[model samples]
Target: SGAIYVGNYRVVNRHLATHNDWANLVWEDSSRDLLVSSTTAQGCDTIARCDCQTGVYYCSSRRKHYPVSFSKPSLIFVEASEYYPARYQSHLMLAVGHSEPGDCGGILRCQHGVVGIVSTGGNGLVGFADVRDLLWLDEE
Candidate 1:
């Protein structure tokens, strides 16, 4: 017998152990979906919402000193100007930064396969990682 491949790959789920260092945490969405584990405590997890029709996911965290980490095995739709109502859709842009000690961070935007970094010029800052999408949304 041989193995099978769908979409050029196979899928599997492996059970993993947990770590103990901090308090248990949990993240839920508007629909009350459990997004993260409620047993781990060292890391923070959250969910960003996107306009359903537009497909632009917005990061709502404004706290300083905390870094936003996207779930690796999850699906996300990126976008351009947060206020433009998504001229494009399903565009991906990676973001990385730690919040300052006492300042609010800014937001991120993706345009033409380029992730732009935006800063408020004082304490709060925002930026994104440059990346490209194979199948851009709204492009058919």
Candidate 2:
């Protein structure tokens, strides 16, 4: 059977700290979401695309947030202008938006490119996990 625990499955990286506040990758396959691959890999966008007050979008929740079978992009309001050091700490990139707990690994995409992934949120605000050092298929 596949891994039941989340952190058990993750792309390798330099910092081998297991106790870090890292997030697991969740792939909800459907017509709307594209699998990450050589053919489907679009762009490695970072938080540099947007700052505080910058508007971003992402598709999360496998039909819980939306009514349709396919997930659609939802507008998210970035609360912080800078990407804080999210790893190994409780601190997370703040943003004002509507996100559910099911969107733990949801992608945060902007008009230019992707930004980060959903970590935790509530009360009209969501925290995003940095993907720069957290998710790395190949060391650059």
Candidate 3:
């Protein structure tokens, strides 16, 4: 009853992605415009971490220019120093494609050093980027 893409319902990634893997938080329903994902055994490659974003307005390198399935295609770790004065600003993104046999995947960025071996093969859109942003910006 599961297994769909560009149609929501993506929560698969049994392996691949290890190195500072504390993003094991699997589900956090907020600030991601409210969303969550689960399902453990018998299935694979269901990653909706929603951590990846901005592949040029949702996607590029082929199709889609809009919403969901991560556009199902992405790599959103873009930053150019919001004003200036930078030492790396931020990075570490991987945009493959929203699996269930969409084609394949690949992407890898770096920042702050020592984030080696961020892997990807099929289910190729792993994400996580929140720089504490001034500790949550004073809660409004």
Candidate 1 lDDT, 15-105, residue by residue in tens: 1112320123222121111112232122221222231111122333443323344322223332333222322222222334443312211
Compute each candidate's TM-score over C-alphas: 0.18, 0.39, 0.18
Candidate 1: list runs displaced more than 4 Å: 1-63, 71-82, 87-140
- Give every collision pair in model 3: 11-46, 12-45, 12-46, 12-47, 13-46, 53-76, 68-71, 69-72
Error of 3 at 69 (Å): 20
Rank all candidate structures by their TM-score, best first, as comma-separated numbers.
Answer: 2, 1, 3
Off by over 4 Å in 3: 1-26, 41-140
| Clashes by residue pair, model 1 | 65-99, 94-129
Better model by lDDT: candidate 1 vs candidate 3? 3
State how far residue 20 of model 1 sits from its true place (Å): 51
Better of 2 and 3 by lDDT: 2
Predicted structure 2: lDDT = 0.37
